[PDB]
Scaffold this active site. Structure first.
Site, PDB file in Angstrom:
ATOM      1  N   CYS A 197       0.811  -1.192   0.000  1.00 21.31           N
ATOM      2  CA  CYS A 197       0.000   0.000   0.000  1.00 21.31           C
ATOM      3  C   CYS A 197       0.850   1.251   0.000  1.00 21.31           C
ATOM      4  O   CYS A 197       1.584   1.506   0.958  1.00 21.31           O
ATOM      5  CB  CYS A 197      -0.916   0.006   1.215  1.00 21.31           C
ATOM      6  SG  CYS A 197      -2.006   1.428   1.358  1.00 21.31           S
ATOM      7  N   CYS A 236       0.103   3.265   2.934  1.00 22.53           N
ATOM      8  CA  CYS A 236       0.792   2.751   4.121  1.00 22.53           C
ATOM      9  C   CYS A 236       2.227   3.235   4.153  1.00 22.53           C
ATOM     10  O   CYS A 236       2.776   3.503   5.199  1.00 22.53           O
ATOM     11  CB  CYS A 236       0.758   1.224   4.164  1.00 22.53           C
ATOM     12  SG  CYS A 236       1.659   0.496   5.552  1.00 22.53           S
TER      13      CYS A 236
END
Length: 121
Positions: free
Chosen positions: A37, A40
């Site tokens: 991600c 992330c």
């Protein structure tokens, strides 16, 4: 140091989430993520940083910054996107503060500080 490895912030698997994150002995800020991600990747430099600060300094007995991989481990929680952040205060784990990510440490401080029962600031 015995514990000096990369992960100040407690990376909690779905196994431990209900014991660690869903603990009311302390305020736990959880981040649901994926390692692939890009969001992330923008959450990590706050998470391991603020998480360091919390799990290294005066809060390492208090609020614990934690995170679970929501795609490696099947979480029984609710995802309001793909990742999600939820603050389980030590007192209101039944109504976490669901977030998607402010991408900042500043907001994290404010987060468990306002949202947390311990007011971790």
């Amino acid at each position: 140091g015995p514990l000096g490895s990369e992960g100040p912030v407690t990376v909690v698997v779905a196994k431990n989430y209900n014991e660690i994150v869903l603990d009311d002995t302390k305020d736990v800020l959880i981040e649901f993520y994926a390692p692939w991600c890009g969001h992330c990747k923008a959450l990590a430099p706050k998470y391991e940083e603020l998480g360091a600060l919390y799990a290294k300094s005066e809060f390492k007995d208090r609020v614990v910054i934690a995170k679970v991989d929501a795609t490696a481990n099947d979480v029984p929680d609710e995802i309001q996107g793909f990742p999600t952040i939820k603050l389980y205060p030590a007192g209101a784990k039944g109504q976490p503060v669901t977030y998607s990510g402010s991408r900042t440490v500043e907001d994290l401080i404010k987060f468990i500080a306002e949202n947390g029962k311990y007011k971790a600031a």
